Write a protein that binds this ligand. Structure first.
Ligand SMILES: *[C@@H]1O[C@H](CO)[C@@H](O[C@@H]2O[C@H](CO)[C@@H](O)[C@H](O)[C@H]2NC(C)=O)[C@H](O)[C@H]1NC(C)=O
Ligand SMILES: *[C@@H]1O[C@H](CO)[C@@H](O[C@@H]2O[C@H](CO)[C@@H](O)[C@H](O)[C@H]2NC(C)=O)[C@H](O)[C@H]1NC(C)=O
Lengths: 50, 49
């Protein structure tokens, strides 16, 4: 319901979430899982702190 | 506890779930966590006139 209220915030109706919840969860899990590979391979992202 | 209403998000003000404050989309099997309750039609007492 929190994600449905975020989609209603960005102008998309709630049935888009409630009929694609598994696909949205899988896309989010893949997007989080790419970040670990990017941080483990490329160490030049933290140039500001360096 | 027994009956289902619809409120606004930031203040508890329950109202009877009709066809005016709800919209119809899809069917039952796709939404996860759906429940069963009657949705009142305001046209029915005018049909009983
Ligand atoms: C939950 O809400 C229902 C729906 O309003 C309440 O049931 C009504 O209670 C009033 C109290 O006087 C009665 O006059 C009505 O006849 C009841 N039914 C309906 C359909 O309105 C209920 O009391 C509430 N509380 C609980 C604990 O269930
Ligand atoms: C909400 O109602 C539906 C049907 O109106 C329930 O789904 C099943 O539907 C078949 C065919 O109509 C019935 O033979 C089954 O008995 C129904 N299941 C049950 C458990 O009654 C659906 O289960 C209902 N959902 C809830 C939460 O009660």
């Amino acid at each position: 319901m929190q994600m449905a209220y975020r989609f209603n915030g960005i102008g998309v109706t709630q049935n888009v979430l409630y009929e694609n919840q598994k696909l949205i969860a899988n896309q989010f899990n893949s997007a989080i899982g790419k970040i670990q590979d990017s941080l483990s391979s490329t160490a030049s992202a933290l140039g500001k702190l360096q | 506890g027994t009956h289902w209403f619809v409120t606004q998000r930031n203040f508890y003000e329950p109202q009877i779930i009709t066809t005016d404050n709800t919209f119809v989309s899809g069917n039952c099997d796709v939404v996860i966590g759906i429940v069963n309750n009657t949705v009142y039609d305001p046209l029915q007492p005018e049909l009983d006139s």
